[PDB]
Design a protein around this ligand. Sequence first.
Ligand SMILES: [Mg+2]
Ligand SMILES: [Mg+2]
Ligand SMILES: [Mg+2]
Ligand SMILES: [Mg+2]
Ligand SMILES: [Mg+2]
Ligand SMILES: [Mg+2]
Ligand SMILES: [Mg+2]
Ligand SMILES: [Mg+2]
Ligand SMILES: [Mg+2]
Ligand SMILES: [Mg+2]
Ligand SMILES: [Mg+2]
Ligand SMILES: [Mg+2]
Ligand SMILES: [Mg+2]
Ligand SMILES: [Mg+2]
Ligand SMILES: [Mg+2]
Ligand SMILES: [Mg+2]
Ligand SMILES: [Mg+2]
Ligand SMILES: [Mg+2]
Ligand SMILES: [Mg+2]
Ligand SMILES: [Mg+2]
Ligand SMILES: [Mg+2]
Ligand SMILES: [Mg+2]
Ligand SMILES: [Mg+2]
Ligand SMILES: [Mg+2]
Ligand SMILES: [Mg+2]
Ligand SMILES: [Mg+2]
Ligand SMILES: [Mg+2]
Ligand SMILES: [Mg+2]
Ligand SMILES: [Mg+2]
Ligand SMILES: [Mg+2]
Ligand SMILES: [Mg+2]
Ligand SMILES: [Mg+2]
Lengths: 98, 106, 51, 61, 192, 171, 199
Amino acid sequence: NTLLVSGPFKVNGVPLRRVNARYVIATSTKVNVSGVDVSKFNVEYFAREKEIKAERVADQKSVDAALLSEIKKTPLLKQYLAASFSLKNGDRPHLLKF
Amino acid sequence: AESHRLYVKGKHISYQRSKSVTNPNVSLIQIEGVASPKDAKFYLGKRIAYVYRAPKEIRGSKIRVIWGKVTRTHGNNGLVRANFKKNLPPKTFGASVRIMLYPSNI
Amino acid sequence: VLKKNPLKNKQVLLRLNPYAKAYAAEKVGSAKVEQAKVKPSKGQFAEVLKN
Amino acid sequence: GRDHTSKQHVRSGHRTAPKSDNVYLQLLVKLYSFLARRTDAPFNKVILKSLFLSKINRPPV
Amino acid sequence: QKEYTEAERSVIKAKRDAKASNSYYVDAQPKLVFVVRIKGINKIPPKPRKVLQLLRLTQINAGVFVRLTKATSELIKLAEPYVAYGYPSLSTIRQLVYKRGFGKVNKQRIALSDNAIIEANLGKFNILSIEDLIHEIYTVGPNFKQVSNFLWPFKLSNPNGGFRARKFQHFIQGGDTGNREQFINALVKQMN
Amino acid sequence: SRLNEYQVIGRNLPTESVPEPKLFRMRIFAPNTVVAKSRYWYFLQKLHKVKKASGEIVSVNIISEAKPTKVKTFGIWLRYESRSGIHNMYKEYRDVTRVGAVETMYQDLAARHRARFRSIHILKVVELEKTDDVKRQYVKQFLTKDLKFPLPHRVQKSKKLFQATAPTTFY
Amino acid sequence: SSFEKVVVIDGKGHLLGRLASIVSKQILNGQKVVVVRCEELNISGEFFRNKLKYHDYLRKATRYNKKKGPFHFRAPSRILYKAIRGMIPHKTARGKAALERLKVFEGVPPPYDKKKRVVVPQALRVLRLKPGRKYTTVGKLSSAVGWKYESVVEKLEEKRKVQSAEYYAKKKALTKKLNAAKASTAESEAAQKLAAFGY
RNA sequence: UUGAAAGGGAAGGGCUUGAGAUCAGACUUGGUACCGGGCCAGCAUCGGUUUGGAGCGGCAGGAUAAUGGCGGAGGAAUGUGGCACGGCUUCUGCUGUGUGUUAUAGCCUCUGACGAUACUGCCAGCCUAGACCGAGGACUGCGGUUUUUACCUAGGAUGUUGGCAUAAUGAUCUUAAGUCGCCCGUCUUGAAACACGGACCAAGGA
RNA sequence: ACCGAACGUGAAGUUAAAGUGCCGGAAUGCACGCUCAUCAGACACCACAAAAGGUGUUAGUUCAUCUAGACAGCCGGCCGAAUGAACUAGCCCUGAAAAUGGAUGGCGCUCAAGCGUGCUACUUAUACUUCACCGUGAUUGCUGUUUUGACGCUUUCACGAGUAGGCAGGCGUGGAGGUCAGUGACGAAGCCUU
Ligand SMILES: [Mg+2]
Ligand SMILES: [Mg+2]
Ligand SMILES: [Mg+2]
Ligand SMILES: [Mg+2]
Ligand SMILES: [Mg+2]
Ligand SMILES: [Mg+2]
Ligand SMILES: [Mg+2]
Ligand SMILES: [Mg+2]
Ligand SMILES: [Mg+2]
Ligand SMILES: [Mg+2]
Ligand SMILES: [Mg+2]
Ligand SMILES: [Mg+2]
Ligand SMILES: [Mg+2]
Ligand SMILES: [Mg+2]
Ligand SMILES: [Mg+2]
Ligand SMILES: [Mg+2]
Ligand SMILES: [Mg+2]
Ligand SMILES: [Mg+2]
Ligand SMILES: [Mg+2]
Ligand SMILES: [Mg+2]
Ligand SMILES: [Mg+2]
Ligand SMILES: [Mg+2]
Ligand SMILES: [Mg+2]
Ligand SMILES: [Mg+2]
Ligand SMILES: [Mg+2]
Ligand SMILES: [Mg+2]
Ligand SMILES: [Mg+2]
Ligand SMILES: [Mg+2]
Ligand SMILES: [Mg+2]
Ligand SMILES: [Mg+2]
Ligand SMILES: [Mg+2]
Ligand SMILES: [Mg+2]
């Protein structure tokens, strides 16, 4: 029941990991991920067994390659993904569209 | 990068009360920028943190939190009723709380 | 040990009233009525407008 | 609140056991509690009730 | 269900026909009433107190079905300052019986959660189902007495939305007591 | 109140002596049909030897406005009770519905004479077809040709408690 | 509706009790409020009527010892303060803290002379009173009942308004130059995109 | 005396939480890196209760709504154009007064065939947000789906993940804050009484 | 002592009477009017005010004069369009004078935060609804599996205010018969103690 998520790591520093759907705001911006292979990723992939596995680093790089290739198409999308979100003074989340 | 806030500012206003009797189990919370029950219904079920400082360190930290949640609206001007694990102490009337954006439903 | 409302629980509704299934299947709650387009008040019932 | 049409928490007003502590009368009440609970004969229910009665309610025959 | 629909269409047709033929169709007077006690248990004069007890309205927000005759109408007139009553629709009866329907079985309040409970207590009166019971109430039937007395008095909640500003004056004068006649359905929707 | 206009028709209960009693109609301004039938019997027992027990309600029908978007002037003839006596009066109202004119009348006698709903009998509500039928100046002043008027001193309602700019009342 | 660090209210043209109730709820709810120009506040009713009311207030004093009785403050800020304290549970610790959250002044002293003053529309006399009604200025009622510093405040207010006018003339000049520069940088690629975004 | 704490014309009390102090407890009498367990939480799904949405759809009734739009007939004025007189206009929303009835604006009444909407009901129609609770403890019942002597939402909460076990958690004591709280006993219709007994404590006391 | 509602220990929802400018939880809510008091008014019981008055203002009733130029004003004219009288009752004012300073509860409020009336929402009782737990009363079953507790176990439903008073079940104290082959100078009893 979790969501598989990538930064991408090169853009953000956020690797492939899981998040809970209730701790996430789903914006309206979308990236075409039909060209991204996420078949091998499942619950057992993130099993608990610092040093990070070479398999995990390789999968990060391989996924981020396709993600960046598709991200470059939309202008300012890489900068948007690389920038953090915060609530400014006078920002009302009940009135904002995400 | 000057701003890092991911919560909505709130205030602990009152307990649930009649003229003479107060009910500490329910707190009245004012969420900033909310002026109607329709606006306040966005925040139903959201978590609330009362963050305060204490004399003794616990695991190297002097910051403690009381957690709660928004349960329902109150009145017509956008106040909400909140339910904390431990009742907010009466001294916090007018103190600021944090209205978290989770559990998210956007 | 625990009363369940037949107006919320569909299983209890079918346990008590087996005909609820036929009512839903036949759409008795939104059944059209076939009738002619008539207006029987054009004459003396216009006594409502004035008298 | 309730508008009570009768007095609340009223005991039946009948003996449900002998006042006597005689163990052998208690054994007789045991036997006829079983018979009255299990035989459908009205005689056993009458005998079971009569074993509870006080001395003046069981005059000598 | 078929006879309910047929009766509704028949009444509609009769009204239209009377309208067409320069006449006036006068509806049949209601034969059933739902009576809700909206007054507390304190400071009641002896005669209306006895009347409310005989109607089994011994708490606030208690509801009962009454078949209208001269005797029962004169009963309800005595209890009028303490009750709100009216003419209940079929859906209102159904919702009451489904959600808050209880039977009096050996002087105990038993939920009507299975048709066997209804059959074991009203099977000698040809009531075999919750829908048989609802029909017997709605179309005031030959065994209305037994079916309505088997039904334990309905214990309603307070209205969601409140009463009018002041309950204890007749519905005609802006209060809540007395006969409201079709608005008992809205009130029951509020309280059930 | 918030009212509707009802046509209530009733009669005496038929007897073997009189098997078709006369049908009587009244126009009642009531919030609902329960008050409509109550007011009907209230006026019939002021006008006829009849009761609800010895009578029968024959028909209750809503009378809708004929032209609910045509501006009219209504004259209403009233009979109200004061603290001292009983008085007849005639007043005029501008509205698009007959019911809304009666609602304005009830507010107006509450405001100007402290006359409650129970103290008022509406004798008659008539739509004044001719401009010469208008007797009262407070409604005659809106029947002048090419009527214009501003609304000086507009007060704007604010959503916030504090405002960072000076208030204005132009309009 | 935002929580502010300090809300500075310009008291000119505000009805006394309506401003008092709004400020009372603000400071009870943890908001710091400063009210300036309390000499320009307003009370509905003619001046003579409000002066008679203040004399009724002055009548009340402890008979056995006048030093114990009510202390009738004559300054406009203290009249506003009395109105607020009557709307505050001032005999509790919470009410005392809430009252510590409040400041009231005649004129606009430093540092508030170079800060932003707001208004409260729900308590503005021009927006609340029917346009024909009579009202009182608290500065005149205060002078009529004993306040000694009316002319000092108006001398200092004229000096402050001269300095604030020099401020405003400079700010308007720099606003005119910045507007001319924004006009120069109009019809640029960024400006067209911001116009398509609504900015 | 020492130590701790509180203290603007009494103090003391109840409820609630904070702070500080004290006490307690599951890694159990745990079993063999692992199995599994305890407590506190997140999420998911369920069941019970309940409050909502600028919710969406279907059906019925009424004057088989009244209106409105379109067509026809009639009419009037707060009379449009035109016309005839005027005061200021290079007739520059020019304007006033008369006339009369659509003209270079329109309106009202009656009406003919359609088409909607409001309102009030019904749906054993659909979607959707939140809160509180989880009593019971092998099976047994009533139903439903039956692809089936099987499965289910159908006689009351489970699944999964994280953290913790020098502790998150709970209780009490002291104290602050919010709110409420008059001195008991007695005789009395009526006591906090400006009615009576009671300074305090121990032992005795009907 | 009035209104609401009557009370076991709790959770959630909803209300009653009363309210929603602040003190105070809930609207400076929507609406039609009225009222300005140099003693306004402000909510039943209830904590007061009358007769009589007012060209203050509002709305009514009935008469009368009116473009065949009403009343007012300059001498029939002159602009032109309404006018006069009596009466009725809303709010306001006069009538309305007491002793400590002081009470619509207070602040304060004037197209109200006042008065009359309508509407929407909202606030909250130990009351109502659902659920948990305690007890009382009733109630279902329990012996070839009753089985070392049947004065027991178990199913179900309803109910719970209380002086004087009655009854029931328990807690505690001195001494007595029996029993624990009970505790105890390796510390009984007593006393102090988050
Ligand atoms: Mg009870
Ligand atoms: Mg509500
Ligand atoms: Mg009420
Ligand atoms: Mg001192
Ligand atoms: Mg404590
Ligand atoms: Mg603590
Ligand atoms: Mg659920
Ligand atoms: Mg038409
Ligand atoms: Mg359990
Ligand atoms: Mg107190
Ligand atoms: Mg005595
Ligand atoms: Mg004596
Ligand atoms: Mg005496
Ligand atoms: Mg006493
Ligand atoms: Mg005394
Ligand atoms: Mg004496
Ligand atoms: Mg004596
Ligand atoms: Mg003494
Ligand atoms: Mg002693
Ligand atoms: Mg009464
Ligand atoms: Mg408030
Ligand atoms: Mg008088
Ligand atoms: Mg007058
Ligand atoms: Mg007076
Ligand atoms: Mg008060
Ligand atoms: Mg009002
Ligand atoms: Mg409650
Ligand atoms: Mg008792
Ligand atoms: Mg006693
Ligand atoms: Mg002795
Ligand atoms: Mg020994
Ligand atoms: Mg010892």
